[PDB]
Structures are given as C-alpha cells and as structure tokens.
Amino acid sequence: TKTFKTLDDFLGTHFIYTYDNGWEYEWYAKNDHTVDYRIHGGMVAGQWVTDQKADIVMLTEGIYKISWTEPTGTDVALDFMPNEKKLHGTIFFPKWVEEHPEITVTYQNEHIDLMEQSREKYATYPKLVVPEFANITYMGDAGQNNEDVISEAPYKEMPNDIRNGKYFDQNYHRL
C-alpha cells in the first residue's frame, strides 16, 4: 500500500471504484492535464473516453481534485483520497442523458458529432446531479501517457481481470 503525498505520486495511477449507488467506474490519470475513463455500471455503463482534457490539482497532501466537461455536456468533479481508498464524485448529467443514455454508450471519441448534435437538440434541464462517495477497489501504476490502459470497450469480466492481474503485462500493456 503506497502513500500518496505529491501530484507526481498521483499522476500515472489507474483506478477502479464503485459509488455508493453501486455504479462502477474506471479512471486513469494519463498526465497532468489529461484523463482516460471507462464506465462499467449505472446509467451510462458502456461509455468510454480517451484524451479527455482536464484540470488536475492536489488540494492538499495526498488529496487530488479533477475537473472536466464531456462531449455530451456532462460535467464532472472528482476528489481522490487514495490514502483512505476512497473518492467523492459529483456528476452533473444533462436531462437528455438521463432520458436517452443509450446514445452515449459508445467510444465517444469516434462519435463526437453525434454527442454534440444530441446535446444541442435535446433537453439540458433539469440536470441529473449525482454526488456520491466511492470505494476504490483497484490502484495500479500505469506510468504516464500509457495508451493501452483504456483502449477498448468495457466487458463484464474486465474489472475482475484487472484486479486479478489477468489483463496487463509487465509493461502495463494489454495481454
């Protein structure tokens, strides 16, 4: 069990967590301004994204705040407390994502025009706001700018394969 004290400690860490609502998420601190993520459960399970532009700060020793906005218009504020194996995340979903989540279940990078046309056309308000604590079930050192971490759609057994060490090689690349 490693102690996180600095931003450098945090960057390059790969996480799997589960919100109190039972929603399982995956997330990767690729470099100081970039994140990859993959959704395994809940309303938007199936969604995954690479090269997401984000603000990443250390609030105070070992506590990290990540802020971004998505192609669908979803806003995300995550607070990592890895020394306590926990997170707090607030997700602000546009109305249309709650109504039609199926649209957004894709590799969003390959469907940006669809997301943006959908977010303009459909309802934004009222937002669905999900502020929840989470338990971290996996933490691995991927190194930074590792393009293999999140590079395929989720499948049901994936998080288990990751946690059992059946997914990545000695280079932290896909088996």
Whether residue 107 lies in the annotated active site:
no
- Residues from 72 through 101 that contact Ba ion (CB under 5 A): none
Binding window for Ba ion (CB under 5 A); candidates: 11-19, 40-48, 84-92, 98-106: 11-19
Nearer to a copy of itself, 93 or 167 (CB): 93
In DSSP notation, 98-151 reads HH-GGGG-SBGGG-HHHHHHHHHHS---S-EEEEEEEEEEEEEE--TT-TTSS-
Which secondary structure element, helix H or strand E, spans residue 10, and what is its range?
helix 7-10
Exactly one of 25, 37, 64, 167 is catalytic; which is it?
Answer: 25
- SS3 call for 161: helix
Whether residue 61 lies in the annotated active site:
no
What does DSSP say about strands 63-69 and 55-60: parallel, antiparallel, or unpaired? antiparallel
Nearer to a copy of itself, 67 or 135 (CB): 67
Q: Which two tokens stand for residue 57?
A: 């700060």
Nearer to Ba ion, 12 or 82 (CB): 12
What's the closest the beta carbon of residue 15 comes to Ba ion, in angstroms?
Answer: 12
CB 44 within 8 A of CB 101: yes
By CB under 8 A, tell whether 73 contacts a copy of itself: yes
CB 147 within 8 A of CB 28: no
Residues found near a copy of itself in the complex (CB under 8 A): 55, 57, 59-60, 63, 65, 67-69, 73, 75, 77, 79, 81, 84, 86, 88, 90, 92, 116, 119-120, 124-127, 129, 131, 133
Active site residues: 25, 70
